Amino acid sequence: HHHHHMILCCGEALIDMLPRETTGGETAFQPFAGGSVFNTAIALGRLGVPTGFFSGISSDFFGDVLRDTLARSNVDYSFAAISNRPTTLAFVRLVDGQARYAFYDENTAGRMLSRNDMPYVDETISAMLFGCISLISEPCGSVYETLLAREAPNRVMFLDPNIRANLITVRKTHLTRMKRMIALADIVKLSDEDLDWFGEKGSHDEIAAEWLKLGPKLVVITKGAHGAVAYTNHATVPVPGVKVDVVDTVGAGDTVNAGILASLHSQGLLTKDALANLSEDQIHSAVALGVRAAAVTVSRAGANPPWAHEMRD
Amino acid sequence: HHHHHMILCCGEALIDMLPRETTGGETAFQPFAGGSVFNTAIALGRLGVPTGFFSGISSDFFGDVLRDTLARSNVDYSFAAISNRPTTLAFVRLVDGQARYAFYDENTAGRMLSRNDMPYVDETISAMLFGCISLISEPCGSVYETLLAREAPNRVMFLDPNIRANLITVRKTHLTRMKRMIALADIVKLSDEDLDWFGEKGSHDEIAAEWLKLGPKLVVITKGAHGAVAYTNHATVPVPGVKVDVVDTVGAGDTVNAGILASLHSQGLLTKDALANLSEDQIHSAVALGVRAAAVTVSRAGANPPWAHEMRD
Numbered sequence A, B: 001h002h003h004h005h006m007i008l009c010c011g012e013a014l015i016d017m018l019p020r021e022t023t024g025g026e027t028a029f030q031p032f033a034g035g036s037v038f039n040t041a042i043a044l045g046r047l048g049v050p051t052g053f054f055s056g057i058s059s060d061f062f063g064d065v066l067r068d069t070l071a072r073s074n075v076d077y078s079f080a081a082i083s084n085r086p087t088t089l090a091f092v093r094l095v096d097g098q099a100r101y102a103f104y105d106e107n108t109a110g111r112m113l114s115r116n117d118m119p120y121v122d123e124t125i126s127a128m129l130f131g132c133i134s135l136i137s138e139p140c141g142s143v144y145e146t147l148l149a150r151e152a153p154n155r156v157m158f159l160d161p162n163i164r165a166n167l168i169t170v171r172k173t174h175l176t177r178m179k180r181m182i183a184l185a186d187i188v189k190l191s192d193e194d195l196d197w198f199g200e201k202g203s204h205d206e207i208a209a210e211w212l213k214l215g216p217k218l219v220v221i222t223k224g225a226h227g228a229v230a231y232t233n234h235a236t237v238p239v240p241g242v243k244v245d246v247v248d249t250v251g252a253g254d255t256v257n258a259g260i261l262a263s264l265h266s267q268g269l270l271t272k273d274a275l276a277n278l279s280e281d282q283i284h285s286a287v288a289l290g291v292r293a294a295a296v297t298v299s300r301a302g303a304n305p306p307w308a309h310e311m312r313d
Ligand code: NA
Pocket: A059, A060, A061, A062, B101, B102
């Protein structure tokens, strides 16, 4: 009965433009489907969760790449708003030792979203997910914030404040905005790197405790190779990392999101009441699935999350 | 004395994003410096003509590619207006048999040019050059049109209406605008493909005759492999093509522009009076240089025009 309820992901869908060598031996940019909320919808799709995607998607050929990717991962993107504006591009370049970024998001299909584009949300939507860059950008951010505010009292809200300082150099109004978004979330997952960008005092375990009093019932901090720690009002759950050979980490965190949600969905715990009474074991299963799933992704030039027929054992 | 006068190119500078294969065996886009007026400035630079470039150039890394390319071809781009807006991108993709295009020009450094950015033009500027896409785009087009109108009475104007239907599907106001630009030009060069987009009656040789009455003293129609025909009020000059093995044709026409101008510059004929009295031989030398120079470009994945120390014999 809970099994057919949908998780509706709301946020950015973009193209990661990553440097590769041509056969001629020179630098080119290879287009990958991407975006944190997008990547999470894909991973939820591949895990067999009924998944929706609300966003602004272009009708150009890059938009085509995104819709094709969603469709092949069984994500329902009928919610999405299609226009003739271009697709967001995120450029990564290697200069000497380090990466440099260029964010091409002028007048895009994603950025120029409108209140009128807001989707109808009925009782078959058990949970919704929001991300950082789309919530912070203007004018689309106003739309997603509105949507989050409206449905927060009705449904499970998952928030991933993935700070991308490299894409958009972050300021206070961004940390200010994100902070007042946290209040509206039931589940919050962020990396230890993300949490540091918030200027808050104390231990990581201490910060999590403050946020649990702000409305979230579950806070998850991810620690790269070292796995993650999950915090609620009833427990703290360390989950060890998994050793694997890493090609890259694009979309790794997004897969963690998906595993946590898929497990809770599967366990039939995606209600506000059930999240308030999670046992230690239920928390561990969710975060562990998240970690296992991300193990696969980092292996093969992700964002390329695992199908559920992968991870079979 | 005429030898130190500068040709000032005014128009777009963009990045051609062309499909290549990665070592991994998949499609990527390789960034090339490009833009018709840009390509022409480069070629004039490499031919040893004192050359200027007025345009809108980004401060991002794509903008860096363009400034580096200009600098290494000895083009003076101090006239250019630098801002923090992104660089124009022109995507080409091969789908089945044919090419498909995507033009990414939202809120760019090039497109958002202003009246205030207009350059000071003194008596050391013998000639100026304008192109199509920048003259048609808004709001930058208003700026270039203004500039052309102001300096037309003072200096030699060269106009290249290179129609790019694939980049921007062309409408009447574009043909209307281009047409009323032609009046202000002393030299006009366009391809037979370009001329067809104008809906005008009669033979190509007939059309050229009409335009010569509109103000232009010299009209050149290029015919791909078959070379070109040059028209004035005193003569008609067929110039045969050159047989070469062609890698591509990006920037070919732009090199023709440069050779015509370089030759006239060298011959000391870049004045309104001298263009009104060109002999048959003087016309032939100019257009022939244009054709020879373009022979080199089409050979090596241009826009990559010849240095004058190439073409040495
Ligand atoms: Na397209």
